[PDB]
Design a protein around this ligand. Structure first.
Ligand code: OLC
Ligand code: OLC
Ligand code: 1Q5
Ligand code: OLA
Length: 407
């Protein structure tokens, strides 16, 4: 049977590798590779591709004579293969951070957290008025004691000076409504705002926060063009204003949002933070593991299982912890979907459901294999053959899954 299990493993690994590669090319071709969803999926696929390819290399290490010798390149392959193992876990954790944040925090919140900055503690602004969050003014009393109270009425609860991230969102949402009220009352801004789609409306609100209604109104020809959906020409005119000269970066992002329609400008910035979770963090982990092996376990290409001293827990450790956290995220996401978002049916909530549905489908497929790992008749043959199939086709499931989310 052992030969059968080996044949299935090579067959599966081939299939999953091809599947992953096809999915990756798909995501690269897409114009949506700009979206944050697709950046994570593509990186997730890459992380998976690398592991499958390394598997075939690892197969060469296996032959006894190389296994025994513990050659230098042998050790590199084992470490590399393990690195990609952690990469897989952390990228999956990547998707889970995104999904969780996707429901709890709106796009417009994220845009103006990059552009004006988020401060969770009470601070005094430039002219000395107490301000918290994304540019929210509490009151103009000189006594911070009074300010703590003013925040409490706003939030509903006693604050002691420091508000939760979810609370800042409520403050921010309030400000956005105020901005819209102002926009609708403005004779110049109103026709333009009403014609714009949701993403561009956000970009208009961005300028309102920085310049004011009166300031944004001053852009007569840019807004005319905006209204006539002449986005390329509208962008040209927006630069010429000195707003651009004084704050190029924020202006470029806001202007670019007018052109495209998308969040691409802000999404790139967000993506670097995911990148660290997926490739950045597992690298110190694997380095620490490799030192451990050099110190007490220099045998057998680093793949020897010795009972022994636990060195594999240096990388296995974080893999386990990352998983638990994802469960906590999932637990919170599912509850939110029942709790507030039953009746919502927005563009975001539909996708989040579709994702959660797919996660639930994905999670037993990958999970059973670990369950079978802890616990060890014709039915014994069925255990091994099942194992051989699940591990080998692990990659294929990921390819299908990523594609399903993208759709
Ligand atoms: C010796 C090696 C140590 C090196 C340490 C590496 C970590 C530092 C990395 C980034 C710093 C620069 C980040 C600048 C990018 C910020 C972009 C942005 O958000 O800001 C736009 C601007 O605020 C609106 O005008
Ligand atoms: C046939 C024998 C040789 C073995 C070869 C293995 C066969 C499965 C491999 C590829 C399927 C990948 C799944 C693709 C799912 C298509 C649905 C999809 O969403 O496509 C659009 C894409 O997401 C836009 O970004
Ligand atoms: C378990 C072994 C591992 C091997 C790759 N698979 C993983 C790893 C991780 C971290 N999360 C997974 O799923 C989730 C969970 C649990 C929560 C959320 C919010 C999102 C996703 C995609 C799977 C299927
Ligand atoms: C939000 C992610 C938190 C990241 C903290 C860890 C910083 C990245 C660690 C190592 C990257 C170096 C390559």
């Amino acid at each position: 049977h052992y030969h059968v299990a080996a044949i299935i493993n090579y067959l599966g690994h081939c299939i999953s590798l091809v599947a992953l590669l096809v999915a990756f090319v798909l995501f690269l071709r897409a114009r949506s590779i700009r979206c944050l969803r697709n950046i994570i999926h593509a990186n997730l696929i890459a992380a998976f591709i690398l592991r499958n390819a390394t598997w075939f290399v690892v197969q060469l290490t296996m032959s006894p004579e190389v296994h025994q010798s513990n050659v230098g390149w042998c050790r590199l392959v084992t470490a590399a293969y393990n690195y990609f193992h952690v990469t897989n876990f952390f990228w999956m954790f990547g998707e889970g951070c995104y999904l969780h944040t996707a429901i709890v925090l709106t796009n417009i919140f994220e845009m103006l957290r990059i552009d004006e900055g988020l401060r969770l503690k009470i601070y005094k602004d430039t002219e000395g008025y107490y301000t918290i969050g994304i540019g929210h003014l509490l009151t103009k009393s000189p006594s911070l004691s009074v300010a703590k109270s003013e925040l409490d009425k706003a939030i509903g609860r006693n604050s002691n000076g420091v508000i939760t991230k979810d609370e800042a969102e409520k403050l921010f949402n309030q400000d956005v409504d105020a901005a819209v009220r102002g926009i609708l009352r403005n004779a110049k801004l109103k026709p333009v705002y009403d014609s714009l789609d949701a993403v561009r409306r956000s970009a208009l609100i961005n300028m309102v926060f920085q310049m004011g209604e009166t300031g944004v109104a001053g852009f007569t020809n840019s807004l005319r063009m905006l209204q006539q959906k002449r986005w390329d020409e509208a962008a040209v005119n927006l630069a010429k204003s000195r707003w651009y000269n004084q704050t190029p970066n924020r202006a470029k992002r806001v202007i670019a949002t007018f052109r495209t329609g998308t969040w691409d400008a802000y999404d790139r910035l967000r993506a670097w933070m995911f990148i660290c979770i997926g490739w950045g963090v597992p690298f110190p982990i694997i380095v620490a593991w490799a030192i451990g092996k050099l110190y007490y376990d220099n045998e057998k290409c680093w793949a020897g299982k010795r009972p022994g001293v636990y060195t594999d827990y240096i990388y296995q450790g974080p893999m386990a912890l990352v998983l638990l956290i994802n469960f906590i995220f999932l637990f919170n996401i599912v509850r939110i979907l029942m709790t507030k978002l039953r009746a919502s049916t927005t563009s975001e909530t539909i996708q989040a459901r579709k994702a959660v549905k797919a996660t639930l489908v994905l999670l037993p497929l990958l999970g059973i294999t670990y369950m079978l790992a802890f616990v060890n008749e014709v039915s014994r043959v069925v255990f091994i053959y099942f194992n051989a199939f699940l591990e080998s086709f692990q990659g294929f499931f990921v390819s299908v899954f990523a594609c399903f989310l993208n759709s």
